């Protein structure tokens, strides 16, 4: 569930999105007081979470969010 | 509240500036038709919703990416 890795969480999220587009969703939460960023994607059958913001990964998180938006708008 | 793409950026910027000392900003992306996409921002007290269509997805994308990278900082 909480795959605290990279290049595996994103692929699983893409597979979940391809499983069903109408129910797939992702929620982004940022906490400045603790300096923590968390990513959660819910498929209404499975849910994945990702703590440990790792500020170096801001670009690869925002790019993933925009890439999901592009597929949601295509 | 349903808001256009322009004022949504400054509303999200003000939301980011509001929760600097306490609070979390929630951003949700979901495919809404009735192609269009739905994006909502809510810290717990104020809710802002915006719909983005294929006619302005490119214009909204760069601004959203720059705003998202501008106001997020964690651990080095």
UniProtKB/Swiss-Prot annotation, chain A:
Gene3D superfamilies, alphabetized: Signal recognition particle alu RNA binding heterodimer, srp9/1 (3.30.720.10)
Principal subcellular localisation of the protein: cytoplasm
GO biological process, one term: negative regulation of translational elongation
The keyword Chaperone is assigned to this record: no
Highest taxon of the lineage: Eukaryota
Family matches, as InterPro entries: Signal_recog_particle_SRP9/14, SRP9, SRP9-like, SRP9_dom
Keywords, in A-Z order: Cytoplasm, Ribonucleoprotein, RNA-binding, Signal recognition particle
Matching SUPFAM superfamilies: Signal recognition particle alu RNA binding heterodimer, SRP9/14
MF annotations from Gene Ontology: 7S RNA binding
Subcellular location(s) of the protein: Cytoplasm
Any Gene Ontology CC annotation: signal recognition particle, endoplasmic reticulum targeting
Subunit structure, as described in the record: Heterodimer with SRP14; binds RNA as heterodimer. Component of a signal recognition particle complex that consists of a 7SL RNA molecule of 300 nucleotides and six protein subunits: SRP72, SRP68, SRP54, SRP19, SRP14 and SRP9.
Cited function: Component of the signal recognition particle (SRP) complex, a ribonucleoprotein complex that mediates the cotranslational targeting of secretory and membrane proteins to the endoplasmic reticulum (ER). SRP9 together with SRP14 and the Alu portion of the SRP RNA, constitutes the elongation arrest domain of SRP. The complex of SRP9 and SRP14 is required for SRP RNA binding.
UniProt record similarity statement: Belongs to the SRP9 family.
Protein name: Signal recognition particle 9 kDa protein
Organism: Canis lupus familiaris
From Swiss-Prot, chain B:
Protein's cellular compartments: Cytoplasm
InterPro entries tied to this protein: Signal_recog_particle_SRP14, Signal_recog_particle_SRP9/14
Alphabetically ordered keywords of this record: Cytoplasm, Phosphoprotein, Ribonucleoprotein, RNA-binding, Signal recognition particle
Listed GO MF terms: 7S RNA binding; endoplasmic reticulum signal peptide binding
Cystine connections: none
GO BP field: protein targeting to ER; SRP-dependent cotranslational protein targeting to membrane
Recorded superkingdom: Eukaryota
Keyword hit for RNA-binding: yes
A Gene Ontology cellular-component term: cytosol
Keyword Protein biosynthesis: no
SUPFAM superfamilies assigned to the protein according to its UniProt record, in alphabetical order: Signal recognition particle alu RNA binding heterodimer, SRP9/14 (SSF54762)
Function per UniProt: Component of the signal recognition particle (SRP) complex, a ribonucleoprotein complex that mediates the cotranslational targeting of secretory and membrane proteins to the endoplasmic reticulum (ER). SRP9 together with SRP14 and the Alu portion of the SRP RNA, constitutes the elongation arrest domain of SRP. The complex of SRP9 and SRP14 is required for SRP RNA binding.
Assembly description: Heterodimer with SRP9; binds RNA as heterodimer. Component of a signal recognition particle complex that consists of a 7SL RNA molecule of 300 nucleotides and six protein subunits: SRP72, SRP68, SRP54, SRP19, SRP14 and SRP9.
Family indicated by similarity: Belongs to the SRP14 family.
Identification of the protein by name: Signal recognition particle 14 kDa protein
Species per Swiss-Prot/TrEMBL record: Canis lupus familiaris (Dog)
Gene that specifies this protein: SRP14
């Amino acid at each position: 569930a909480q795959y605290q890795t990279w290049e595996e969480f994103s692929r699983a999220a893409e597979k979940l999105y391809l499983a069903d587009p109408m129910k797939a969703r992702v929620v982004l939460k940022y906490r400045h007081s603790d300096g923590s960023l968390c990513i959660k994607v819910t498929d209404d059958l499975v849910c994945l979470v990702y703590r440990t913001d790792q500020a170096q990964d801001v670009k690869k998180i925002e790019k993933f969010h925009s890439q999901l938006m592009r597929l949601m708008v295509a | 509240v349903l808001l256009e793409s322009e004022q949504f950026l400054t509303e999200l910027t003000r939301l980011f500036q509001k929760c600097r000392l306490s609070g979390s900003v929630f951003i949700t992306l979901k495919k809404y038709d009735g192609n269009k996409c739905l994006l909502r921002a809510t810290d717990g007290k104020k809710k802002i919703s915006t719909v983005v269509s294929s006619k302005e997805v490119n214009k909204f994308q760069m601004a959203y990416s720059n705003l998202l990278r501008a106001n997020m900082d964690g651990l080095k």
